[PDB]
Amino acid sequence: GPPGPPG
Amino acid sequence: PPGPPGP
Amino acid sequence: PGPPGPP
Amino acid sequence: PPGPPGP
Amino acid sequence: GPPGPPG
Amino acid sequence: PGPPGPP
Secondary structure, eight states, X not given: OXXXXXX | OXXXXXX | XXXXXXX | OOXXXXX | OOXXXXX | OXXXXXX
C-alpha cells in the first residue's frame, strides 16, 4: 500500500 | 492498505 | 501494508 | 505528529 | 512529523 | 514524532 501519513 | 502514521 | 510515513 | 515544544 | 513549537 | 522545537 501507499505510505502512511506524516507523523 | 496504507502504512502507519510516521514517528 | 505500506511503509510508515516520515517523521 | 509534531515534535514536542522546545526547551 | 514537523518540528515542535519553539520553547 | 517530529523533532523538538528550538529553545
